[PDB]
Structures are given as C-alpha cells and as structure tokens.
Design an enzyme around this catalytic site. Structure first.
Site, short mmCIF file in Angstrom:
data_model
loop_
_atom_site.label_atom_id
_atom_site.label_comp_id
_atom_site.label_asym_id
_atom_site.label_seq_id
_atom_site.Cartn_x
_atom_site.Cartn_y
_atom_site.Cartn_z
N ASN A 166 -2.71 -11.90 -8.86
CA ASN A 166 -2.07 -12.12 -7.55
C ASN A 166 -2.86 -11.53 -6.40
O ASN A 166 -3.52 -10.50 -6.54
CB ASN A 166 -0.65 -11.54 -7.53
CG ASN A 166 -0.63 -10.04 -7.84
OD1 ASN A 166 -1.09 -9.61 -8.92
ND2 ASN A 166 -0.11 -9.23 -6.91
N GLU A 177 -1.48 -4.22 -7.35
CA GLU A 177 -0.36 -3.51 -6.69
C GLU A 177 -0.82 -2.33 -5.81
O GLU A 177 -0.02 -1.78 -5.06
CB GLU A 177 0.70 -3.04 -7.71
CG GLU A 177 1.57 -4.21 -8.14
CD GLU A 177 0.76 -5.36 -8.85
OE1 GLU A 177 0.14 -5.03 -9.91
OE2 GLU A 177 0.74 -6.56 -8.34
N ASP A 216 4.32 -12.72 -6.37
CA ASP A 216 3.56 -12.06 -7.41
C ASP A 216 3.59 -12.85 -8.73
O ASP A 216 3.84 -12.27 -9.81
CB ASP A 216 4.08 -10.67 -7.64
CG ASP A 216 3.31 -9.89 -8.74
OD1 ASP A 216 2.12 -10.08 -8.86
OD2 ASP A 216 3.94 -9.15 -9.52
#
Lengths: 573, 71
Positions: free
Chosen positions: A261, A177, A303
């Site tokens: 991801n 992230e 994601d």
C-alpha cells in the site's frame, strides 16, 4: 535455481514456503486421503520456545526439518531420524527496539533454502525483523554471511521470507505504516553482494524498468509514473513495501510479486495514482528489470496492501492453453493474468459483498470505483467491504491441477474509516486513519472457498467462525488442509467442501500446513501459535476497538478460544 | 472520481467533489519537512556502503566479518 526446482518435485521435500516456484501448495502424496484422514493422529511435536504469532511453516530438505520463530527469529534444525534432538540452533541477537516498529505483531514468514553450490555448501536464509538477511550453513548452522537490508531507525523491518532464484536471494521490505518507501533487493548467495534493488515509487531508474516495460499493455502505464502520479516528493515516503510472497517461471526467467500500500493511509495527503504501489510485477531474474507491472488499486483509500501470493498455473483461456498467474488480493478481487505478457484475463470478486469497486473493466484494466465507499478527510466512511485486513491476506493458497481449482482461506471483514492529518517523522508511525472493523454482511468472519480462477466459478463455499488467515495445502488425496485462528487444523474434501477431520491444537494458526514423505510414510506438519494482525488484541492485551489498526474490535472474541503459544505439530497415520 | 477518466495512460486520479487538485497550499497540505523525507534514502546509502565493505573484506581475506570497525 534449477537444482532447487528439481528438489521441489521430490515428495520427500518441502524446500520453500510456497512448496515450489509455482506456489501450487499441492502434493501428489495420497497415503493420507479423504477416506482415511479421520484416522490421522499426532505423531510427534516440538516447542519453538517463543510466543507471538508463528507465520510460514517448516522446510524439509534431505531428511532435515527447519523451524523458525517470531522475534528474535530463532532457527533450528531437526534430523527426521531423531526428532527429539536439535541438530543445530541459531539464536540472533537483535535490538529489542525492533519490536516497537512492527505494526501488527513480530511475525516472520520463514526460511529459504538453496542446495550446494559452486557457491558452495547448502544454505538456509533468514530475514530478521531488525533488517538483516542471514545465510547459514544448512547442515551445521554456522553463520556464513550477514548483510543490512533495512534500518529499524527508519521504521523499516523485514517480515516476508527470503526467496532463492538461481544464484540470488531476494529480500523484500516492510514498514509502509511508517512511511517506508518499498524496495526489493537481490543478493548473491555466495558472498551477500547486492546485485540489484528495485523501488516501488519514484524515478524510473529506481523502479528498474525494462526498455519494453508494459509493451503488451501500454494502457497500464509506462514511463515517468512513479513521479507523475504523486505530488512533489510525497513518493519518498510513499509505501509500496513487499512483505508477501513470490513466484518464478524458469522458462521465462521472470519473478512475480506484489507491492504494498501507499503511505500514509490518509488518502487526502497523497493525491494521485500513487504508482507503483499496489502493483503486480513481472521482473527479469538477472537484472530485476520489470517487463510488466499492473496496478490493481490506483490511489489506494483502504490499505488493500498488494502483497498477497502469486499462484502459477497453465489453463485454457478461450480454448488456448496459457501460462498464468492468479492472485487473490486484499481488495477482494482475484486477478488472473497472462504471466508472459501481463495481460488481464479475469478479475472477479472473491465474495459478492466487495463494494469499493463495482467491477473491473477487463479491457481498460481499471477498477470502477463506487464513491459511496471511498475514504477521504472530514468524512467517516461506513460499511466498506473489504476492510483493510482484506478478504484475503498473507496465507499461501493451493491449486489442484486435475480439478483446475484454487482453494482459499477467505476473510469476511468490513470497516468504517476516517482519516486524520499527521506529520511524517522517520521512525514514527505514519498511518493517519481510525478504523472500526466487524463481520461482513454474511455474519461470520471467515470462509473457505474453492474456485476456478479463469471463469470465476465458485465450486463450493463454507463458513468459518474466524477469518482463515494461514493459507492452505491441497493433495491428490482429495483434501485441503488448513489451520484456523481459534486453534484447529482441519481437512476438507476438495470436491465438496465436506469437513472430514479436525484436531484441537494448543493455539490458533496463522501459517500453512506442509506435507512430506519420510522413510516411506507421509506426514503433515503445522505451526500452532496465534498472533499477527488478528491476534494483536490478545498478544498485547489491547481493549480499545480501534487499536491494532482496527483489528481489536473485530477479533475481541478470539481470546475466548486461544492463548498465545509456540509449537510444531506433526501428524501421520 | 470513478477511476475511469484518464489524463494519460496509467494516470486516472481525479479530486473528489469539493477537494483540491493539489494539496500544497490547501487545508490538506501535508507540509512535509524535506529533511525528514530524505532520511531513509541516506540510511540506505550508509547500509549499502557498510555492506560493500563486508563484501570487499570477504574477497580480500576469504573470511566473513560483519563488524565494519573490525575490518
């Protein structure tokens, strides 16, 4: 590690988060069983001294229980003959700025253990949020060595448990992230020396590939793809962190795990397959060289971080007994591969509402995408199942080898999603999507399911008010135990799903139950302390439905049932 | 883009209808600063060098020391 493997077979112990190198989460203990679990009571309890989400669970080895917390990741040891006293404590001093680069609470998935040792004494290993791998003396708590794996200044933390294999301890990564390029690292247990480090994207020498990589399934892709499936240098910030769980087959000397991801969440900023994010790996233990790699979710748009657990079993595939891995991904598919060759055996939907993919073609290995549920710049995509929280997340699940059934805590959560452009700056978030989440079409947020992973046949399915996040424990007593976000531990009959017992814990559960025998009696233990991604709204007092990366709106009712907490509960008859 | 038309084994990406083959020079150009991109690899090299110092000191003295200024 052959001695760790032998200790795992003793029902007095629970030596690793996954119980054993196959991640069975299955106990042969039967004192507690479907016909008497209604009489299970609280035996004793401990406080952890922290709030926030309590993921993983305790370890038990040689008559000592080991407990760990969320940040600052305190550790303590309890002699099971004197449950009120802490035998030793370790209290890390960490930069509080570590908390600011954790997307979804300051969770820690727990300790690992190795027995004594040419290396020499038995050790407990802790991954700290601040990026350190720490080796402690398992009997005294003395710090033996400590190394820097990850740098919080780059947004890179640790949250996954360490994993011990032979004379090495493996340390993952976290921060996709924040544009962290994923890597897994092996350290020597004696001195903390880095032995090997395998990245998830970029040039082949960084990926650490065997010369025979994907020889069995060349249609998966082989060489040059960690560069050729990205545009330019976008791989350098390209995600693929591994913060979930591992398995190990000692006979093949292979380690299995999933990479996470790609970054950013905005798919439009990173054209290409984005290999080898979202990949099921089989790596040689000594060298780290990948023998196979299967990309489940090419060019992720959702994601569906590919980090979930790997459960090993040996089952008949077209009448031939075959070594397998089974892997319930965030993307809502349950993958079963041959764990020697990497060949795909099945990939079925964990719930029939999954809609990003029509089906996986098993011959090509490719998921056939439904463009109606794609994501893309300048579009608000609506009604995609699963959400980014997945139809399965970080819970370790369980396998009854007599029934040939996996038992899984399942999420039923869907989303709208719209990306946005944003710059990468090291240390800052690098998400680039706005999400809204809500219950899937069946109307509730959780389920528990029992399934055959070769055939895809669902034995039974039951609803849960919230997503079942912490995984499961199954036993030869014909029971599966799990915790719920709303603050129960429950036990269900494994043949039917029937609910046999429930107990109201102080706080929601985001880790797994354990069981062990001590002095001739069976115990069940679990953490209570809600948090993690579903608990972000209540932990941080957030109210915007799109905050917590879309989790806040979906989980807004959770704070009506639970507060934060931090405790260990131990039950017996 | 259904994921099934592959330019090469392991390489099946296509642009969606109306989107570009390459982002550079497009309205979706991420325009990454090569200097920002390189920061995490530089940080890793620096951690790896400090850790090697701690290892070497342990091999030399038989005692673990974390703080590299104290070696």
């Amino acid at each position: 590690n052959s001695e760790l493997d032998r200790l795992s077979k003793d029902d007095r112990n629970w030596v690793m988060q996954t119980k054993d190198y196959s991640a069975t989460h299955f106990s042969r203990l039967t004192e507690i069983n479907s016909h008497n679990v209604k009489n299970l009571k609280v035996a004793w309890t401990l406080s952890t001294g922290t709030l926030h989400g309590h993921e993983g669970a305790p370890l038990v080895v040689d008559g000592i229980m080991y407990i760990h917390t969320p940040f600052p990741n305190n550790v303590y040891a309890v002699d099971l003959n004197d449950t009120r006293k802490m035998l030793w404590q370790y209290k890390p001093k960490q930069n509080p700025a570590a908390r600011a680069v954790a997307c979804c609470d300051v969770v820690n998935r727990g300790l690992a253990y190795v027995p004594a040792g040419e290396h020499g004494p038995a050790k407990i290993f802790l991954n700290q949020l601040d990026g350190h791998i720490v080796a402690l003396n398992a009997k005294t708590g003395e710090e033996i060595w400590k190394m820097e794996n990850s740098d919080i200044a780059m947004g890179s933390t640790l949250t996954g448990a360490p994993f011990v294999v032979k004379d090495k301890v493996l340390v993952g990564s976290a921060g996709a992230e924040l544009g962290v390029r994923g890597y897994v690292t092996a350290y020597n247990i004696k001195d903390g020396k880095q032995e090997w480090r395998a990245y998830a994207t970029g040039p082949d020498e960084d990926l650490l590939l065997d010369k025979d990589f994907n020889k069995d399934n060349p249609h998966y892709g082989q060489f040059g793809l960690g560069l050729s499936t990205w545009e330019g240098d976008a791989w350098k910030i390209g995600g693929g962190t591994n913060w979930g769980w591992y398995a190990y087959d000692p006979k093949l000397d292979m380690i299995y795990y999933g990479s996470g991801n790609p970054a950013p969440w905005n798919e439009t900023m990173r054209p290409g397959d984005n290999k080898w994010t979202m990949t099921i790996w089989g790596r040689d233990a000594d060298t780290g060289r990948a023998k196979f790699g299967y990309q489940k979710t090419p060019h992720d748009e959702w994601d569906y971080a590919g980090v979930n657990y790997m459960g090993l079993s040996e089952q008949e595939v077209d009448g031939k007994l075959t070594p397998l891995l089974t892997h319930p991904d965030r993307n809502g598919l349950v993958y079963t591969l041959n764990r020697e060759t990497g060949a795909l055996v099945n990939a079925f939907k964990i719930d029939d509402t999954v809609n990003w993919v029509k089906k996986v073609d098993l011959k090509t290995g490719l998921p056939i995408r439904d463009p109606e549920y794609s994501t893309r710049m300048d579009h608000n995509a609506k009604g995609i199942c699963p959400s980014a929280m997945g139809y399965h997340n970080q819970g370790i699940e369980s396998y009854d080898p007599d029934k040939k059934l996996f038992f899984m805590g399942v999420n039923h959560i869907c989303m709208d999603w719209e990306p946005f452009m944003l710059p990468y700056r090291a240390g800052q978030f690098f998400v680039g999507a706005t999400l809204n989440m809500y219950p899937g079409p069946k109307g509730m947020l959780g389920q528990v399911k029992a399934m055959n992973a070769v055939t895809g046949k669902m034995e039974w399915e039951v609803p849960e008010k919230f997503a079942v996040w912490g995984g499961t424990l199954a036993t030869a007593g014909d029971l599966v135990f799990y915790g719920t976000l709303d603050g129960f531990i429950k036990a269900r009959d494994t043949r039917t799903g029937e609910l046999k017992w429930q107990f109201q814990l102080p706080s929601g559960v985001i880790g797994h139950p354990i069981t062990y025998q001590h002095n001739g009696k069976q115990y069940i233990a679990i953490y209570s302390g809600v948090g993690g991604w579903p608990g972000v709204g209540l932990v941080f007092d957030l109210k915007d439905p799109t905050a917590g990366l879309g989790a806040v709106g979906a989980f807004r009712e959770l704070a009506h049932y639970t507060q934060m907490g931090g405790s260990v509960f131990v039950f017996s008859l | 883009y259904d994921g099934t038309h592959c330019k090469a084994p392991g390489n099946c990406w296509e642009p969606k209808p109306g989107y570009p083959d390459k982002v550079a020079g497009s309205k979706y150009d991420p325009k990454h600063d090569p200097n920002e991109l390189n920061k995490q690899a530089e940080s890793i090299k620096a951690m790896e060098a400090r850790n090697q110092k701690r290892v070497e000191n342990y091999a030399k003295t038989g005692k673990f020391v974390y703080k590299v200024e104290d070696i």
